[PDB]
Ligand binder design. Structure first.
Ligand SMILES: *C[C@](N)(CCC[C@H](N)C(=O)O)C(=O)O
Length: 274
């Protein structure tokens, strides 16, 4: 198996061309390869596949370090765009991709950043998925040590966004794991902790489903901003500062796609026998 190693703000990926290779594996193999000392080392593994809808350019699959397959990853989408460009799978400036859920568009900007059309955020609890009687802007999640309030939203993956007073002292280390597998999120959830600096600027930490606290989560940045906009606490264009760097999120509201712009970097190429 040929692969490439990439990162987006220090959220690191194995990216595989599954167009010119026949790529498949077990979750055990994913977990072995994710290990940083005895494997390759990654937060997620991404596959570029031929599209099912031949009008699109590619299909996009995402696997967490724990071996789980999921339907979204924003930092990965930016790396996907850089990968297919660098490796000559396409030279289009606007690249259309499917996932297990919805479609996206990856735009390779002249400054080399990638702007991703992530699709429209999803609010309906059953679709997140999230167990709730009714849609609300804030939901109560009881944990063993604290009851917290969150907004809940899907970007193709589930997010619970908790607002915090101070990002450095937020109890991500204990609350993250308790929220990630909270009973009300039947497919688990990415737990984001958001400090609002002003209506155009937040700081964010994300305890990811399947990966723990990474250096950056693009979909989590998207979700945090969507939630703050829904709650009337943020404006439509927001700088999000994650441990590994910043992203720009733009969302004009319900009915509109959400856009995420930031860096993506190729590191090295590899070969491994699975
Ligand atoms: C790649 C990622 N950090 C999201 C990866 C998937 C989540 N861990 C999930 O399980 O939904 C991003 O940048 O969005």
């Amino acid at each position: 198996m040929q692969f490439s190693k990439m990162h987006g703000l220090g959220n690191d990926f194995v990216v595989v061309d599954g167009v010119t290779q026949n790529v498949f594996f077990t979750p055990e193999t994913i977990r072995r390869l994710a290990n940083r000392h005895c494997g390759i080392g990654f937060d997620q593994l991404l596959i570029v596949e031929a599209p099912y809808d031949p009008e699109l350019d590619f299909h996009y699959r995402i696997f967490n370090a724990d071996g789980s397959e999921v339907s979204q990853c924003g930092n990965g989408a930016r790396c996907f765009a850089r990968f297919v460009t660098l490796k000559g799978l396409t030279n289009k400036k606007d690249i259309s991709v499917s996932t297990q859920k919805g479609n996206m568009v990856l735009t390779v900007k002249d400054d080399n950043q990638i702007r991703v059309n992530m699709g429209e955020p999803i609010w309906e609890p059953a679709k997140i998925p999230f167990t709730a009687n009714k849609f609300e802007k804030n939901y109560i999640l009881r944990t063993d040590i604290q009851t917290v309030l969150c907004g809940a939203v899907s970007m193709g993956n589930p997010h619970c966004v908790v607002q915090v007073d101070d990002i450095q002292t937020a109890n991500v280390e204990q609350l993250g794991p308790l929220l990630e597998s909270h009973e009300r999120f039947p497919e688990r959830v990415n737990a984001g902790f958001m400090q609002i600096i002003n209506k155009e600027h937040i700081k964010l930490r994300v305890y990811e489903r399947g990966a723990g606290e990474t250096q950056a989560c693009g979909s989590g940045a998207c979700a945090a901003v969507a939630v703050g906009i829904m709650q009337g606490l943020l404006n439509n264009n927001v700088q999000v500062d994650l441990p590994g760097g910043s992203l720009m999120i733009e969302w004009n509201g319900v009915g509109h796609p959400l856009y995420m712009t930031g860096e993506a970097t190729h590191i090295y190429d590899g070969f491994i026998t699975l």
